[PDB]
């Protein structure tokens, strides 16, 4: 599929918590990394629109794209950087303890794999636990 914002919007409405669903969308986003900025914009908008019980899966997709992008270049890391902290704060406010434990694990993975520098990791931790 060629890239369009509307096609991405439709894929995000269909995203589920399965390994195949997150991975398949992520691979498309990495293929279309030239468009990482509008990807992040659409991603954020649809995260905020999504029902509480689907919000963690948005952050899982962000995890997959950012991590799988590292071998390609800094662009996805940089373009998620300005919204990722408020994304964590949002999901944290919108979900329960159980979901927060899942979010915390993503953060621990990010710390151990140096997905972001400590400045951003410290902001993510404050967003979850402050």
């Amino acid at each position: 599929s060629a890239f369009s914002e509307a096609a991405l919007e439709k894929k995000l409405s269909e995203l589920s918590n399965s390994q195949q669903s997150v991975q398949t969308l992520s691979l498309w986003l990495i293929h279309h990394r030239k468009h990482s900025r509008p990807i992040v914009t659409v991603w954020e908008r649809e995260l905020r629109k999504a029902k509480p019980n689907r919000k963690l899966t948005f952050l899982y997709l962000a995890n997959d794209v950012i991590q799988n992008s590292k071998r390609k270049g800094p662009e996805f890391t940089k373009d998620f950087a300005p919204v990722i902290v408020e994304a964590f704060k949002h999901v944290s406010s919108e979900t329960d303890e159980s979901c927060k434990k899942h979010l915390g694990r993503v953060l621990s993975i990010w710390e151990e794999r140096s997905v972001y520098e400590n400045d951003v990791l410290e902001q993510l931790k404050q967003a979850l636990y402050g």
Partner: peptide
Amino acid sequence: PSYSPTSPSYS
């Protein structure tokens, strides 16, 4: 089969 956030190839 549910998503695993450790699944991406790294670190």
